[PDB]
Amino acid sequence: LTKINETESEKLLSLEDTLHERVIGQKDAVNSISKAVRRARAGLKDPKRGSFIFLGPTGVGKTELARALAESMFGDDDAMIRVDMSEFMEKHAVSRLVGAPPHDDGGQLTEKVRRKPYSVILFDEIEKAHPDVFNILLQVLDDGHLTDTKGRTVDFRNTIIIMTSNVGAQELQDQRGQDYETIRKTMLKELKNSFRPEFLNRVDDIIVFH
Amino acid sequence: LTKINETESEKLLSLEDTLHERVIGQKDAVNSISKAVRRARAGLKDPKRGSFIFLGPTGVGKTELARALAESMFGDDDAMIRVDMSEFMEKHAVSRLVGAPPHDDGGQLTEKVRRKPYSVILFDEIEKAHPDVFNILLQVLDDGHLTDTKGRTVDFRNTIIIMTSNVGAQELQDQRGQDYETIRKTMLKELKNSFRPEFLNRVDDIIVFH
Amino acid sequence: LTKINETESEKLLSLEDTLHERVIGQKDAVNSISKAVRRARAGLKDPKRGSFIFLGPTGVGKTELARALAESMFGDDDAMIRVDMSEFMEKHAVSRLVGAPPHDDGGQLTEKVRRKPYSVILFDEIEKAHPDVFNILLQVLDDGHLTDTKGRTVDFRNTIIIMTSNVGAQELQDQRGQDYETIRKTMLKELKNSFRPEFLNRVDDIIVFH
Amino acid sequence: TLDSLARDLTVIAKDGTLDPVIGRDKEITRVIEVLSRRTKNNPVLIGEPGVGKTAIAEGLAQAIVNNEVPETLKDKRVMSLDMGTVGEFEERLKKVMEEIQQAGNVILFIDELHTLVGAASNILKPALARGELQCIGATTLDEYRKNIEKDAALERRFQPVQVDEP
Amino acid sequence: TLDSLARDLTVIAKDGTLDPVIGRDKEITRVIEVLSRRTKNNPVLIGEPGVGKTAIAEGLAQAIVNNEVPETLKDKRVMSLDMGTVGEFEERLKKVMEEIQQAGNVILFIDELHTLVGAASNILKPALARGELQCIGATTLDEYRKNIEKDAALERRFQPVQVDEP
Amino acid sequence: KLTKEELKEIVTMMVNKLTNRLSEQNINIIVTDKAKDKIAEEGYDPEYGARPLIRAIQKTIEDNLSELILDGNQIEGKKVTV
Amino acid sequence: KLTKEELKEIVTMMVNKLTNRLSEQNINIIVTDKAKDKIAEEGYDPEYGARPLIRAIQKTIEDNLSELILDGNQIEGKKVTV
Amino acid sequence: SVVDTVAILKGLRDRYEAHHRINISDEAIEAAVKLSNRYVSDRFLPDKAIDLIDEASSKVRLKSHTTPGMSTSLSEEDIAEVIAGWTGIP
Amino acid sequence: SVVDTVAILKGLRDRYEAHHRINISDEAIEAAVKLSNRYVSDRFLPDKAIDLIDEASSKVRLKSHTTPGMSTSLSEEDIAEVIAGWTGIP
Amino acid sequence: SVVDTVAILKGLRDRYEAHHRINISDEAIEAAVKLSNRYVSDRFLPDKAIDLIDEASSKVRLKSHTTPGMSTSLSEEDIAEVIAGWTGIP
């Protein structure tokens, strides 16, 4: 049916109330996300260019959303790729991006994209990962495609990526129901700390979970 | 038309105002570059001998210039070759220069020159790359041609190479609008640190971006 | 003409002013070298027995000399062999000297001598190379010929070898114009540190670059 | 003889059996001009398979029967390889070579696998290396890295060319 | 000739020698439509062994003798491989190929091991690669990773398809 | 030094990616120098250069589009800005 | 220490590569000591030595040639400088 | 180039429709040309278009071949459906 | 030697022009001789010149062969163009 | 041994001179024997001498063969020249 119908606007037009079928709260963000991924079309932004920093906890739907997203979008959640920023330290760039001597190994989630060009990419308290990765994170942010250790450059725009932060765990104390604009700002710099904005500037938008 | 006209001085004579069609600032360097590549003719220097250390940031035109250069010079930017000094560590010399047992692999940008004898070569905060490479960097600086792992020696003078440095990121604080001669000197030794001058002495000239 | 004339004394007799055609400074060493290689004849030393430790920097002519040497001596510089002491660690003895199981590989510069029996051999801050090599370095120093992993023993006296040291980089501060005898001594022990003299005792002589 | 595996599309092009190409003209101009060479008449192609290259070949053959082919080659004619097999095998393939060399009037295009084989290696490759018999190969470099290159005299026999997706 | 190893189940299906299949129809529709291709008439299958696939094959053959086969192939007929061996061996297997190519009227299904062998490699595989002789393979990918793929031109010869347990 | 020239000059080629991709979306584009400069004003930083501009632009710029992509009032192949 | 001698002296043999290659281009060469020295002035650095000179020269030097290689006004086998 | 492809497809435009007895609509033709290039890595728009095309040309014929009158190939579904049949989210 | 080559080329000078119906201009002949030796590693000026030559002799004939009157082979383009066709930056 | 070689060369002394119509001078004969052993790694003085010899025997004959009267083979040049022709720095 989705294979059938998928007119290319039924999601979008309904995507909120579509998405609304899932997780209460962040309706805006939900909307924003809906809003966002619509820019994943029209190519008014870089046709090669899906970048979401979750501000939230466990139980926050960070998974759900991301799950449901392609499960909504790509009609499955297996498009998603878990990636542990705990596992991002110094040299995993190889195990991110094909070595070729240093076996020759590259991509925990890439070859999976080499497997699955339409996908979703989850990262974990992502700033937890090292200034090592930020550039290869930036690689994603770069150009909206993904180069490889063998060099192969592949579209991100045909996939999604996910960023998560508990950074405001404190600053959550605000919505633990205060106006987020406090913590929004309050976390912003805090994560803005970890990242040259340019990093942050290819973000779709930052995602609170309240 | 360029195929037509290219008299062998129209660029040169106009090359500034040619180049000026592109990126404001570094007009001198632009000029110098124009000045430089003219020595890429006349053979008054070694006919086998194009070497540019960019002092600058993102947005600094480091790419633009280099892009436009052959895009100006060779009437295309695909002559250029991106090379990640991050990817230059210890043994990539093989993956720079043909192995032959250690498959047999050589040149991330070479075989591309083996593909494309008229080209441009970009390196990245280049001193970021290892004293490993400096000699095979020096190989470029050597003799103005490029030997291979199979041994094949090929002209650099028929291509361009690019060096980039954020080293003065601090020292940029000067032109963040102070007289560069400070930071020029101030970065000079700083990069002069990383390199035996002989390395630096085959440079066309160091390129600030202010 | 050299093929023609080469009487076997025209070099020698003129070798200084011959060599003087090249690099100012170290005229003595130049002379010494001239002096030296003359002992490469007369067989008053071991007819099987050309060993030069360069004390100097980049730009120091270490290359030039060595280059010009056979380029003077053997009427070409391709007799020379670059060898990276950086690349001399533990097991390269095989890749110095034919394996035969451990493919079967031997000589980065040997098989080249197996190729070219009249040659020149460059080593790099040589003490940078490992006590691994000193004995196979000593192999050169040994007997004035070169055994192989297949066993083949071949004359060094029909070639040249080169040793380089920046060791006095500090101690260069002397001639950075002080009497070298200071640094001569001062570096001597310093390199004498790295080597049992016997190593050093087959040297033609140590070569300063001032 | 000069049949079975020996076949040509030129007449077929004069027969109109095939498709008028576009755009690889100056591309072919090269491929064409490869034959001019006393050194290497024999080009090989790199690129993406299935893209029209053997029609790009035919493009020559059209331009041949078009007589867009200039002089020397105008008498010569395409041969489109046939690949198949049947005691020994290759000797046939070996055999045809003198025949076409006897033909004094044609050219063959070797197609894709120019092969490092078990049963192989130098087959015509010497008669290739004979410095005679104008022929054309093609592949993508992934193969090109080997046979033409691992000799390098077949590299000295072959002229590589590639064209991007139109 | 065209016997011994050469055999067919189509008549056997018209003989009713075998089982009416179910459900792989549109699956076969693909397998069917593979033959349509000037590029690759020749499918291969992936999946779980012993599941009905060679009957899925027969499913075609039924749909063939059913004339659920559309036009071009309707004249053509199944061949079910026979595997066995007997001086040389494969040359026979090599031999039959022209015979069936001579047949102008059939198709063979190659069955499972499409083999990287000691005595082997390219056997018919060129005559396969000849770009003629509509045929079908099958395996599970575990093998598929190699022969069709390690060439990739046999990949360019073969069309992979797989179906889950019904 | 990268002159005010360069700033707004690069601010041009900044637009390129938009056009060379989006309008290549196919949507006409208007340019308010003032804002562009007001942007370029905030666009160029000493330290980081104008480099933030990429982000700087996209934020509101792609937005107002994406917004007016929704707004159904004035739509593709038009142009509007702030 | 490498005396002012050496500086301009090397500045000579600096010219050699030009001549020994280019004019070996075949183009006569004039030498303005002042500029040469003005060059040599900026030519020698304490730290790096005059070593930059190689670059230093080529930049403008090969240029003005390459320039006057174009300029069609005064041409090969002449000599001009700054 | 995608466009030349269309032309070369226009080259085979008559070809497989005269095989598949259909009417190619260049709308489709350019469509997949973009779309395949967008969505298909492996084969090449010089073909893979026609792949889609002929396959679309089949799918129509398929419907048109047997029980589903349009002999022409639509732009969209011919691309879309098939392409959605290729992937999803039409 | 480059020069002897010219002579040996002068040897085949009549040869392939009487094949290619053109007029060789020794200017070209010496030209590539230097130039190829300069620009071509692999084949040998004993040939590669003639290679260029015959190829130039083709390229002219090519133009001269069909629609582009000079039967002679220029110095420059014959070298140059072809050599630029060989490499670039004429 | 170098010396036995001379003898074994003396063995073939008549041989190739009666082939090459020359007069071998043992001075040469012992000469290369040392000299080749000195200068030639690969072939063996049991031969390589004679190699030089016959080659010298040629070179003389060569000169003697055609326009350059001595039928004998010199010590030196026969060794030397040829050996210098082998290497250099006579």
Numbering used by the authors:
A (entry chain B), B (entry chain H), C (entry chain N): 488 to 536, 539 to 591, 596 to 669, 679 to 712
D (entry chain E), E (entry chain o): 162 to 247, 255 to 286, 295 to 342
F (entry chain G), G (entry chain M): 713 to 794
H (entry chain D), I (entry chain J), J (entry chain P): 343 to 410, 466 to 487
The authors write:
The bacterial AAA+ chaperone ClpC associates with the peptidase ClpP to form a central proteolytic machinery of Gram-positive bacteria. The ClpC-ClpP machinery acts in regulatory and general proteolysis, controlling multiple cellular pathways and differentiation processes and is crucial for bacterial stress resistance and virulence. ClpC activity crucially relies on cooperation with adaptor proteins including MecA, that target specific substrates while concurrently stimulating ClpC ATPase activity. Here, we report on an unexpected mode of AAA+ chaperone control involving transition between an inactive resting state and a functional hexamer as revealed by determining the cryoEM-structures of S. aureus ClpC in absence and presence of MecA.
Additional extra density caps the hexamer and accounts for the N-terminal domain of MecA, whose structure is unknown. MecA binds to N-terminal and middle domains of each ClpC subunit forming a separate layer on top of the ClpC AAA ring. Additionally, binding of MecA to MDs breaks head-to-head MD contacts and is therefore expected to prevent formation of the ClpC resting state. MecA prevents MD interactions and thereby converts ClpC into a canonical and active hexamer. Taken together, our structures of ClpC alone or in complex with MecA show a dramatic reorganization from a helical resting state to a planar canonical AAA+ hexamer, explaining ClpC activation by the adaptor MecA. Quantification of co-eluting MecA suggests the formation of a 1:1 ClpC:MecA complex, consistent with the binding stoichiometry determined for B. subtilis ClpC/MecA complexes and mass determination by SLS (767 kDa). This indicates that MecA binding shifts ClpC from a large, non-hexameric assembly to a ClpC6/MecA6 complex. Once formed the hexameric ClpC6/MecA6 complex is stable and does not dissociate spontaneously, raising the question how ClpC activation is turned off.
